Design a protein around this ligand. Structure first.
Ligand code: HEM
Ligand code: HEM
Ligand code: HEM
Ligand code: HEM
Ligand SMILES: [Fe+2]
Ligand SMILES: [Fe+2]
Ligand SMILES: [Fe+2]
Ligand SMILES: [Fe+2]
Ligand SMILES: [Fe+2]
Ligand SMILES: [Fe+2]
Ligand SMILES: [Fe+2]
Ligand SMILES: [Fe+2]
Ligand SMILES: [Fe+2]
Ligand SMILES: [Fe+2]
Ligand SMILES: [Fe+2]
Ligand SMILES: [Fe+2]
Ligand SMILES: [Fe+2]
Ligand SMILES: [Fe+2]
Ligand SMILES: [Fe+2]
Ligand SMILES: [Fe+2]
Ligand SMILES: [Fe+2]
Ligand SMILES: [Fe+2]
Ligand SMILES: [Fe+2]
Ligand SMILES: [Fe+2]
Ligand SMILES: [Fe+2]
Ligand SMILES: [Fe+2]
Ligand SMILES: [Fe+2]
Ligand SMILES: [Fe+2]
Ligand SMILES: [Fe+2]
Ligand SMILES: [Fe+2]
Ligand SMILES: [Fe+2]
Ligand SMILES: [Fe+2]
Ligand SMILES: [Fe+2]
Ligand SMILES: [Fe+2]
Ligand SMILES: [Fe+2]
Ligand SMILES: [Fe+2]
Ligand SMILES: [Fe+2]
Ligand SMILES: [Fe+2]
Ligand SMILES: [Fe+2]
Ligand SMILES: [Fe+2]
Ligand SMILES: [Fe+2]
Ligand SMILES: [Fe+2]
Ligand SMILES: [Fe+2]
Ligand SMILES: [Fe+2]
Ligand SMILES: [Fe+2]
Ligand SMILES: [Fe+2]
Ligand SMILES: [Fe+2]
Ligand SMILES: [K+]
Ligand SMILES: [K+]
Lengths: 156, 156, 156, 156, 156, 156, 156
């Protein structure tokens, strides 16, 4: 199905954010595992899988709209150096990514690509779940203190 | 365990090839799916999961040796335009990556990092399977013809 | 609950498209079964059932909005004479019908009938799947050849 | 049980044919597997196992009849270089070998070794099955064409 | 994948040892069974099957490296006349064969064929287990006496 | 099978390290259980069992190679008097042991005792997992504090 | 609970005997397995595990009584070089150990450490079962002869 060319540019920009998240979150997962924080590591692993599934859906939509998925260009990864930096780096990636999802949805609606909009709203639903998780961990660290927070995420 | 710095560079070089292969085979898988060659698509999908698992093991080894895994740098993806070309792009990438594996196994052996050698050998075993899959598909295309070959890979 | 008269006219227009498709896909399904192309016949039968379910949901929404569903006017059936034409005829109806879905969705949004919009988007999601199935078969005919394509769809 | 010295010699001649077939069919099996014709490789593998069981039964009868099984002397393996040649090589081996089985059955009759006759009759029953399979494949290559024939034996 | 010609010769040389061992051990096994030493016969059958599996893996690897497997040239079978002689002949063969396995491993390492080296290492692990079994039987014959040793292996 | 005399001396040296580890870790497990740190006690008991399995495999190998396992000469146990030091005592033992594993792997490689190298490489694989566990616990003590770390390991 | 200093010294003396027994019996079990006397090997492995359980219970008791388990000072292992002598080596070790158990039971009784007496009496119960097993095997060697006795313990 010939799809709108700016829609496809948008889809490819969102795809570009997923591929950053995939790699960013996977490395965070394995850093946590390596430091003995296996509960943070497991959860972060599943975040990474969600982003992999976002990427898949975008790639499949782009191809169906007869565009060319771009897996070549990869933005800056925000790799933190400690647990609090790492959650904040994820948050900042998410908030940026939702900005771009909103503008892409706006464009889909102008052009009447309601299916692409439905796809992008479903991803948006999921990134707002991620943001809620990230904000809440940053909040808990304040409430229970960093030492207690890490202790509670040592063991699954 | 403080690892040998050049061993870690080598591991990061291998990882860089895994990252190329992940994206390349994942896109090839989805192209085949989008064209209705679902059986090619499923097989290429599992090859990408395999490279995801290679990348995972490399990342965990680098962190154990106290290096920094590099997911930022992504080499060139060779995306073909038809089935013979996609298989040959995968083959070229695999053959190039076994060269890097062999040079890195040599160096692990020189510095007595036998466990890293074991991981690289197991990865190498899996890449020689991939090479065998790809060379065999290219051969079957010559023997049965491209149209029959694709016919046999439409339905899963 | 009293609906916007123009939303109801749109809904009746979409219904008119569904009723064409129902009869066209069902007749195509049975032509393919009669020619011994049973795997095409089975899939076309299921597409026909999908259109019946679209029609059903539209009829129910129209009665809820206190309009009169129009099952009396039946537009033009596009019956093909061979596999390639039948696929193309269906694809032509689907693209015609998706244009009417997008204009009816615009109107639903202008008058704030968001439940009718939800329904029409769900139907549109499924037509874009139908279009993908149909584009893809026509692409497979090109790639594997017509005789092979038909061979692969003789048997369930 | 002291067995007839020439019966024992006939049993070692059949044994020698079996040992040729074991190696010949097992190499053909693995060549077909290595080319991606797994349905031909698997069938040929089962033929090789049949030949192993023949050999086993002959070895056991020879030793019962107080002879010395000869596993030392190996005739010429006929190794084709493509599917048609491989099949014909196997058919040639089966035909030469039935001739030798008939001669041993004749001699077993004349000296009243009816139990060795029964064993050889059973092996011959199996060689005629192998012959029927080989001739039928070579005939199918004619009837459906070689590309199709190989297409139909890529997959299990 | 085109492999080192001299590695392939080494594999073919290991393969030639396997083919000796297969025949030598199958015959010894059937000899013990005919003499009513069924437990010796059963164990020796399983060693012969091991050698078959070794030969299989070597054939498949030669063919992937694009060499030609040599199943034609069968070396000297060393066949005993009594239990003590037969065990000692197997042992002589295993020790010769592991000398060739070590020389072939050395060569794989020199040319970086690490996967062939893993295969050979796995075969050698199994040959050392065979040597252990054989030296230990010859040991037990000395400790329990020949008649007791044979008595203990009449029944399975 | 007569083994190389220096290989056996090396295997006895590795074995002396295992015997130190068994005792040190077993006592450490029972100190922690006695202090009510059952989660540390239990994991340390399993570390001790791993060393018992290493000792076992080395003894079996030495005997196969016709050497004498030396279980008589017990090196210095490092028993701390508090949790952090006991973790550090175990880490220094592991780091000295791997020194000796690598030296011994190098000698097996020179004299072509590849099966012994395999066994030693597997043990090494397992000592690096031990080193990783120990390094990480000392790391968590800093990240979460000594009292939380102990708290987290009171209860199974 | 502060324990009596001589009781703890006695428990450490018993413990030193257990540690000798663990090693002597474990090596004996692995010599017999290596000679193909698996029924002796296996039973001796379980004797060794019994001593490991005795060592365990004594360590736990010493720690409860706030002493230091001495696992460092390993007495003389009696390793024979043949089956009869190994049985006799184990019997002399057991007979010397019970000497020390009785002396220690007497001291627990004088200082009213009744729970320690219980533990020591249970171990004693178990050493007399060991003495009974060992005495009986040396008796059967005379009654049935060395070669039959060994024959009977080749196979599980
Ligand atoms: C373009 C990038 C990627 C895409 C589109 C992608 C896609 C996927 C998908 C769809 C799955 C299966 C999810 C499921 O059904 O639960 C998966 C699994 C997985 N991926 Fe990725 N992935 C990508 C990159 C990566 C990277 C960079 C890594 C590691 C650094 C990775 C590691 C994994 C792992 C470990 C699994 C689990 C495999 C299993 O289930 O056994 N992936 N990926
Ligand atoms: C106003 C037009 C139609 C409507 C609204 C309609 C609706 C439906 C619905 C809702 C179903 C149930 C589907 C399921 O969930 O399994 C159904 C089944 C079916 N329809 Fe239709 N239909 C229409 C016209 C037709 C026509 C014209 C044909 C064939 C000439 C047809 C043939 C069938 C068949 C064979 C089934 C399956 C029967 C079964 O369930 O055993 N329908 N229809
Ligand atoms: C004297 C020559 C041989 C004899 C008498 C022989 C005999 C046998 C027998 C009796 C079996 C068990 C059949 C069954 O009941 O399933 C067997 C299995 C097998 N043989 Fe042979 N064989 C011979 C040569 C070979 C050779 C030369 C190869 C390979 C190059 C080979 C490969 C195999 C394999 C792979 C199996 C299957 C083993 C398994 O169960 O995984 N054999 N053989
Ligand atoms: C030469 C030294 C030793 C060797 C080779 C050895 C070997 C073994 C082996 C192979 C096992 C069973 C492993 C399994 O399959 O689960 C075992 C079990 C055990 N060992 Fe040792 N061991 C040694 C010394 C010790 C010592 C010194 C102690 C205590 C102070 C000890 C305490 C235990 C315990 C409690 C078990 C658990 C028994 C079971 O449930 O199977 N061991 N040993
Ligand atoms: Fe996402
Ligand atoms: Fe498409
Ligand atoms: Fe835009
Ligand atoms: Fe949706
Ligand atoms: Fe996200
Ligand atoms: Fe890889
Ligand atoms: Fe670490
Ligand atoms: Fe290097
Ligand atoms: Fe490994
Ligand atoms: Fe690969
Ligand atoms: Fe295939
Ligand atoms: Fe008809
Ligand atoms: Fe529809
Ligand atoms: Fe109503
Ligand atoms: Fe309108
Ligand atoms: Fe809805
Ligand atoms: Fe439709
Ligand atoms: Fe289809
Ligand atoms: Fe046969
Ligand atoms: Fe007989
Ligand atoms: Fe019969
Ligand atoms: Fe045959
Ligand atoms: Fe067939
Ligand atoms: Fe072998
Ligand atoms: Fe090949
Ligand atoms: Fe060489
Ligand atoms: Fe291997
Ligand atoms: Fe062997
Ligand atoms: Fe019997
Ligand atoms: Fe160890
Ligand atoms: Fe031995
Ligand atoms: Fe050395
Ligand atoms: Fe191993
Ligand atoms: Fe360790
Ligand atoms: Fe823990
Ligand atoms: Fe508690
Ligand atoms: Fe004891
Ligand atoms: Fe206490
Ligand atoms: Fe006393
Ligand atoms: Fe008691
Ligand atoms: Fe005892
Ligand atoms: Fe017994
Ligand atoms: Fe036995
Ligand atoms: K706390
Ligand atoms: K065809």
């Amino acid at each position: 199905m010939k799809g709108d060319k700016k829609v496809i540019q948008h889809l490819n920009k969102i795809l570009g954010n997923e591929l950053i998240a995939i790699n960013q979150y996977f490395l965070h997962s394995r850093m946590w595992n390596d430091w003995g924080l296996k509960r943070l590591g497991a959860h972060e692993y599943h975040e990474s899988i969600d982003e992999m599934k976002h990427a898949d859906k975008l790639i499949e939509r782009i191809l169906f709209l007869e565009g060319l998925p771009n897996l070549q260009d990869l933005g800056k990864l925000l790799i933190g150096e400690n647990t609090q930096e790492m959650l904040q780096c994820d948050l900042n990636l998410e908030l940026k990514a939702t900005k771009d999802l909103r503008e892409a949805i706006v464009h889909c609606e102008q052009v009447h690509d309601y299916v692409s909009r439905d796809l992008l709203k479903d991803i948006l639903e999921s990134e707002e779940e991620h943001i809620d998780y990230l904000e809440t961990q940053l909040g808990l660290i304040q409430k229970v203190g960093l030492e207690n927070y890490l202790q509670s995420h040592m063991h699954e």
